[PDB]
Design a protein around this ligand. Structure first.
Ligand SMILES: O=c1[nH]cnc2c([C@@H]3N[C@H](CO)[C@@H](O)[C@H]3O)c[nH]c12
Lengths: 154, 154
């Protein structure tokens, strides 16, 4: 019954960011009643001693995106992380709900409407796309933004 | 008397990174007795910079690298931050002490010795550069690593 969010981020690659940045974002999402699939935590059942572990991780994440209800993509950085971008593209083509997170104040875009490369927004509505665009962790729980509307049927 | 470290990083660009990742690194360096120059706070670079102010910021950082004793460069990301790289090149050419920090486990290099672009190591010794290369915040206080040895004369 709980909506499922795939929490796509590059924060698992750095010891500090995985330890400090991810838990507050997971907590905010769970506070909304969302079930959070965080792929760095989810893929620790893989045998990383066997040579094929990379393929198995790839397919597990592909399946998690097919089975989630929405993606919450941390698109910090210049540019955003390539694996997050692949996962985001998967979610767009599978008609998943799309939520984007960027608290990076640098401006790196190819157009004047959106704050990043326009293809990151291809799965969002023409009107109101910014309602799915989160620029601070405290904003995740805002009743005026899309995550909350999604959860309240509005 | 206190040695001066320029803490170069991209962590001031993100609100969560600025608030959560930087203070533990600053206090680890200060715990060794280092005067830490953290440019985002020092040069008040807290948002996007205006039409009369960005040249002064660049000059302040250039003078800070000229006046420091060493640089502590956070070279996480793929690739490392371009401004951190500019500041690092300044410190290399000015024969400053060089310390590098990367807790990102991803390999992204053009060579087999170094985990990053070989130019980042041009101010480090040929043999034993790993003593200046920190891969965890826990490691900063290590008496077997180059920062401590630098302060105590080995
Ligand atoms: O080594 C890995 N372990 C777990 N997940 C990933 C990923 C996936 N891609 C995303 C970032 O590259 C991340 O959110 C995760 O879903 C790439 N590499 C790894």
């Amino acid at each position: 019954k709980r909506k499922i969010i795939y929490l796509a981020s590059p924060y698992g690659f750095s010891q500090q960011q995985k330890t400090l940045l991810l838990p507050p974002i997971v907590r905010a999402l769970e506070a909304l009643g969302i079930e959070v699939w965080e792929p760095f935590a989810r893929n620790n059942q893989i045998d990383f001693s066997q040579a094929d572990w990379a393929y198995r991780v790839a397919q597990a994440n592909l399946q998690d995106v097919k089975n989630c209800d929405g993606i919450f993509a941390v698109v910090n950085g210049t540019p955003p992380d390539e694996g997050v971008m692949v996962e985001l593209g998967m979610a767009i083509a599978l008609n998943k709900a799309i939520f984007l997170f960027r608290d990076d104040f640098r401006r790196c875009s190819d157009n004047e409407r959106y704050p990043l490369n326009l293809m990151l927004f291809a799965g969002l509505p023409e009107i109101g796309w910014e309602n799915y665009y989160y620029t601070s962790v405290d904003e995740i729980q805002s009743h005026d933004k899309a995550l909350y509307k999604w959860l309240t049927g509005m």
